[PDB]
Amino acid sequence: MFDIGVNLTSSQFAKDRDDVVACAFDAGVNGLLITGTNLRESQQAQKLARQYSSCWSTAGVHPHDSSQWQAATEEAIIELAAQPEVVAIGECGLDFNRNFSTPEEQERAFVAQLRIAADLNMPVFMHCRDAHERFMTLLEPWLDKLPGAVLHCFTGTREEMQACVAHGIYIGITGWVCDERRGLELRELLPLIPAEKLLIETDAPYLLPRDLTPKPSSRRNEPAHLPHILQRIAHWRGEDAAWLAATTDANVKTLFGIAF
Ligand SMILES: [Zn+2]
Questions:
Q1: Is 91 among the annotated ligand-binding positions?
Q2: What distance in angstroms lies between residue 26's CA and the mean position of ligand 1's atoms?
Q3: Cα 116 to Cα 12, 59, 78, 166, 167, distances in angstroms
Q4: Cα separation, 113 vs 116, whole angstroms
Q5: Are 75 and 107 in contact (CB under 8 A)?
Q6: Range of the domain at 16
Q7: Helical packing angle, 71-81 and 103-120, nearest 10°
Q8: Are 162 and 191 in contact (CB under 8 A)?
Q9: CATH code: domain of residue 59
Q10: Can you tell me the distance from the alpha carbon of 73 to that of 22, in angstroms, rounded to the nearest whole number?
Q11: How many domains does the structure of the chain reveal?
């Protein structure tokens, strides 16, 4: 039961972070991957990972902040990646919907990170929004030199999903699928994702599962809700939850090279 997408540096967790973490482990979660989205967040993510047991982090620059990418940024990321806690380069990718940085700025930062990851032999943690065609064109030639790649918070079409899977890319699924309103579309394709390419996450504090029975709705999501998300996904795939938990943990071990 590993959460590959915890935004643990969020201010929403400022007052009770020690509690959020202890409750996650007590609920059966055995590992958290803390997302870094720019240099300062990545440094904070690594410090949090070193502070708590069973935590690792990513180091990179999100397309939104790619405008901040400079040569000095590159050095700082390489240095951060050498730390034991940092196991993946990213969040990186492309976002042609928001365009908070120009496409030109985005491509430069994304390619520079693919390059860092290939050099260091580390997997990449990616984001893609309304940029699938260009995204795959830039990513495709780097895959044979990377240990792996995951596209987290995947909400795309089955055609995009099949293309990603055909290239050996892991697919991250959140509680988004527990929303009768927006997630039915993704829910329908869950049976199509190869078991060996599926990773689960909460994207906490966001995306609180709507079908959450306890009913603490319209609130902060947290990793302690991962088991509920996994039960649901297993149900929609026809699988046993304990079996799915073991299979996804194996995928995490395979992709990131960690013991948890
Ligand atoms: Zn995610």
A1: yes
A2: 22
A3: 31, 11, 7, 24, 20
A4: 5
A5: no
A6: 1-260
A7: 30
A8: no
A9: 3.20.20.140
A10: 33
A11: 1
Q: How far is the centre of ligand 1, averaged over its atoms, from the C-alpha of 178 (Å)?
A: 15
Q: At what angle do helices 241-256 and 226-237 cross, to 10 degrees?
A: 110
Check whether 152 is labelled as a binding-site residue. Answer: yes
CA 10 to ligand 1 centroid distance, Å:
14
Residues 6 or more apart from 71 whose CB is under 8 A from it?
A: none
Phi-psi region of 80 (alpha: psi -120 to 50; beta: other; left: phi over 0): alpha
Q: How was this structure determined?
A: X-ray
Provide the 3-class DSSP secondary structure of residue 194. Answer: coil
The single residue listed with the structure tokens 């967040």 is 41
Measure 43 CA to ligand 1 centroid, in angstroms. Answer: 19
User: Rounded to the nearest whole angstrom, what is the distance from the C-alpha of residue 153 to the centroid of ligand 1?
Assistant: 4
> Which residues, listed in sequence order, are joined to residue 94 by a DSSP beta bridge?
128
């050996």: which residue's tokens? 168
Q: How far is the CA of 65 from the centre of ligand 1 (A)?
A: 17
Sheet of 55-59: strands edge to edge?
2-6, 31-34, 55-59, 86-95, 124-129, 149-151, 170-173, 198-200
Inter-residue contact 151 to 139 (CB < 8 Å): no
CA distances from 179 to 60, 123, 176, 185, 220 (A): 30, 30, 6, 10, 16
Ligand 1 centroid distance, CA of 35 (Å)? 9
64 is in an annotated binding site: no
- Distance from Cα 213 to the centre of ligand 1, integer Å: 22
Resolution in A: 2.0
